[PDB]
């Protein structure tokens, strides 16, 4: 930058803009943090709900193959078709897109509505809830991680500003100020010198 008065005023404008941008970014981060701590509670709650719903399917699968037939379950598993209706919905959270699971997952539309075994029937209804709670946990934790990413992104931006740009602009400013003061001092010394010189000469001719 060339040291002038115009440049100096422009640098001061830049410094003021940078500070008024720093505080704005901080406020955005504060709102993000509110959202994040609001999410984490419900996320751990959904994880607890998943934990409890795991015991039901676990209990159903333990005595099913054990007390009832050990191979009827394998036969029925090979019987029932798998799921390919697991389409996922797009979701934007704070200006960025995240997936959202919307698996079709029918209930009565599949094989064997009411069938032969006593425990293989109720167990098949338990992994229903297992999968449902699991995909709920998926949907909440994905957004949680996204919000965390945005928070650390904003933090990185704020630190970058407050420790790279502001000091650089302050140093530029003070360097320009020194240059301008120096030139003004030189020119006034020169003026005084010529004034005294001509005054001595005129006192010589009086």
């Amino acid at each position: 930058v060339s040291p002038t008065r115009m440049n100096l005023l422009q640098r001061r404008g830049q410094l003021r803009l940078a500070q008024k941008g720093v505080d704005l970014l901080k406020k955005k981060r504060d709102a993000l943090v509110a959202e994040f701590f609001g999410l984490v509670r419900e996320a751990m709650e959904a994880r607890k709900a998943l934990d409890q719903a795991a015991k039901e399917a676990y209990a159903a699968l333990l005595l099913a193959q054990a007390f009832d037939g050990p191979e009827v379950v394998a036969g029925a598993a090979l019987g029932v078709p798998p799921l390919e209706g697991v389409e996922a919905e797009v979701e934007n959270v704070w200006g960025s897109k995240v997936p959202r699971l919307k698996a079709t997952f029918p209930d009565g539309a599949l094989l064997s509505p009411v069938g032969t075994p006593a425990y293989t029937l109720e167990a098949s209804r338990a992994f229903r809830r297992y999968a449902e709670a699991l995909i709920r946990v998926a949907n909440t934790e994905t957004r949680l991680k996204k919000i965390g990413e945005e928070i650390k992104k904003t933090t990185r931006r704020v630190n970058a500003l407050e420790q790279v740009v502001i000091p650089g602009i302050r140093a530029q400013i003070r360097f320009i100020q020194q240059v301008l003061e120096q030139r003004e001092r030189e020119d006034t010394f020169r003026l005084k010198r010529i004034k005294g010189k001509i005054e001595a000469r005129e006192a010589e001719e009086e």
Partner: protein, 159 residues
Amino acid sequence: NEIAAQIARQATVRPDLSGEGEKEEPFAVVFAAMGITQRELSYFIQEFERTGALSRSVLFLNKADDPTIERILTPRMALTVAEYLAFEHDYHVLVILTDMTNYCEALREIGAAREEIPGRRGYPGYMYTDLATIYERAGVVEGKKGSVTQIPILSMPDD
């Protein structure tokens, strides 16, 4: 200096595009060096004698080991010769003034030896009029064929 020499070597008018005139006689280069060093002067002279343009070039050399106050006269002599050639013998002249920074050095020196009121950074107060008396000696004249084209070269001190 390389850009200036390249321009001098390649420059030409295109009369097949204007349709008017079909002569295409080359330029006559007037070249004035103020405070030029031996390195840059050697480069210029060798380039010119390579392209075969010395037979139609006038040179006013003021090297860096020559006296300083001579540089007050080199531009004016060069442009006198240029104006004469152009507006008396219908030449198309190309003037290259190799460093105006040195001209301003000499101007400031002779001005401060004389104890005037200086201008922005010590340079004299009449430097604008002084430079205008040099640049404004160019152009084309009504009712004549010659022309004087200037390419000053100066070095911005701290870029």
